[PDB]
Every structure is written in C-alpha cells, then in structure tokens.
C-alpha cells in the first residue's frame, strides 16, 4: 500500500527529541532502533515504480544460472581434489592469519604495557612472535602459490564451462516438462544428485556421461510421448 510511502522514502519532520512521520493520517514517532525488511516470495509478481526505485532489490534465488557455478565444484572435486581441497584454505587462512597478525599485535602490546616494571615476561610472548616467523612468512608462503593456483584455476573453469552450458540447456528442458504437466517435476538437486552419479578429450567423455546419465534417471519419470 501507499501508506508507508513515506517510510521507505526517507522523509521525516524532526522535532527536539521527537522524530515523526506521517502514515495516511497520523503522525507517528520513529525509534531509529526501528528498521524495515520487505520480502517477497514471487518474481512473477510486479512492484510499483515507486518502491522499486526507493527499495534495494536482492534476489535470493536458486536458479538455472545457480547450476553452473554448482557443477563446477562437484566436478573439481572428482577433478582435481587436491586443489579445490587448498581453495578453501587459501582465502581461509588469508583472512585467518592476517586477524591473528592483529590478534598477536594486540597480545604483545598489552603485555608490553603490564610487564615493563615486572620481570621479562614479555620474552614468553617472544616466543610466540618466534612462531608468528612461520605465520607471517606463512603469508608469503601462501602468497606464492596463489600467483601459481589463480591462473590454473581460470584454466580450469573453461573445460567445466564446457560442461557447464550444455547442463543448463538440459536442466531447462527437463524443467520444461513441468510447465507442461504437474507430475514433471524436477529439481536443481536432482539434477546435482545425478550429476554426482557421472563419476562414482576426458571432458568430452564426461559430457557424453551426463546426457546419459540424465537419460537414465529421468526417463523414468516421464511417459512415453515425453521420453521420446
């Protein structure tokens, strides 16, 4: 409705203490504690001008592009594990050794502080600082192998791009078979489910993997006109 308008428009008549805004008819006072979501459940369904150009659109949606990112770490861990295994670490412990470099900065600097009138003391945290010359070379050590993991990453992306087109223009056939009947139905998990079934030139196998698998599975579930 119309009403709270003025609530997402940020317009206010401030007062001393006091400020108000207006809502169809009276004047009501906000908190500044107060703070305002609006969600909605249909993409389908439209949005006054108004609001979508006052209201910060973000679609949490899973869709058919969702499955192109999703394949391609399924893929590289039944690819390359040792690699998407040192992934995850990479940005971890980037950030990870980098907020206990401020961490240690911190324990050194309120020790220092302390046990400057006692005795030195200060040399049991040393030690640790010893340690953080495995923890910040750990940084350059990681920095590294990054300069040599980014690029053979983005080598990687293109053959599961390859990949990854043709599992989109499937997944959205079969999702066509839904538009047309209720019971075909399919989901992305479905899809990802049967995708993982494909392993447990070498891309262009594992292509022809796929379209059979997904052959296999979802034959299943459609009738004899669908199927063919």
Same mark, same amino acid.
């Given at each position: 409705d119309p009403i709270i308008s003025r609530l997402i428009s940020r317009e206010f008549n401030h007062a001393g203490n006091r400020v108000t805004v207006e809502i169809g008819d009276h004047e009501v006072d906000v908190s500044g504690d107060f703070k305002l979501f609006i969600h909605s %459940?249909?993409?389908?369904?439209?949005?006054?001008?108004? /609001?979508?150009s006052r209201v910060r659109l973000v679609h949490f949606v899973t869709? *058919? +592009?969702?499955?192109? $990112?999703?394949? &391609?770490?399924?893929?590289?861990?039944?690819? #390359?594990?040792?690699?998407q295994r040192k992934r995850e670490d990479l940005i971890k412990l980037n950030t990870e050794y980098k907020l206990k470099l401020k961490n240690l900065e911190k324990r050194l600097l309120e020790e220092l502080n302390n046990s400057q009138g006692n005795m030195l003391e200060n040399d049991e945290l040393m030690v640790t600082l010893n #340690?953080?010359?495995?923890?910040?070379? #750990?940084?350059?050590? *990681?920095?590294? +192998?990054?300069?040599? &993991? &980014?690029?053979?990453?983005? #080598?990687? =992306?293109?053959?599961?791009?390859?990949i990854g087109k043709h599992s989109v223009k499937?997944?959205?056939?079969?999702? *066509?078979?839904?538009?047309?009947?209720?019971?075909?139905?399919?989901?992305?998990?479905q899809f /990802?489910? %049967?995708?993982?079934?494909?392993?447990? $030139?070498? =891309?262009?196998?594992?292509?022809? /993997? /796929?379209?059979?698998?997904?052959? %296999?599975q979802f034959s299943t579930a459609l009738d004899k006109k669908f199927k063919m």
């Amino acid at each position: 409705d119309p009403i709270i308008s003025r609530l997402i428009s940020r317009e206010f008549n401030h007062a001393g203490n006091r400020v108000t805004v207006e809502i169809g008819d009276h004047e009501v006072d906000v908190s500044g504690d107060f703070k305002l979501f609006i969600h909605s %459940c249909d993409p389908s369904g439209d949005i006054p001008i108004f /609001l979508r150009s006052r209201v910060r659109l973000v679609h949490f949606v899973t869709n *058919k +592009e969702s499955i192109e $990112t999703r394949i &391609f770490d399924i893929t590289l861990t039944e690819e #390359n594990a040792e690699m998407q295994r040192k992934r995850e670490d990479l940005i971890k412990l980037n950030t990870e050794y980098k907020l206990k470099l401020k961490n240690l900065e911190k324990r050194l600097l309120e020790e220092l502080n302390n046990s400057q009138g006692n005795m030195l003391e200060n040399d049991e945290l040393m030690v640790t600082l010893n #340690n953080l010359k495995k923890e910040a070379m #750990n940084i350059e050590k *990681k920095l590294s +192998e990054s300069e040599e &993991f &980014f690029p053979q990453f983005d #080598n990687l =992306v293109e053959e599961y791009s390859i990949i990854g087109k043709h599992s989109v223009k499937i997944f959205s056939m079969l999702e *066509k078979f839904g538009q047309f009947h209720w019971f075909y139905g399919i989901s992305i998990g479905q899809f /990802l489910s %049967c995708f993982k079934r494909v392993f447990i $030139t070498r =891309v262009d196998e594992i292509l022809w /993997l /796929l379209y059979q698998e997904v052959y %296999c599975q979802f034959s299943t579930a459609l009738d004899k006109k669908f199927k063919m």
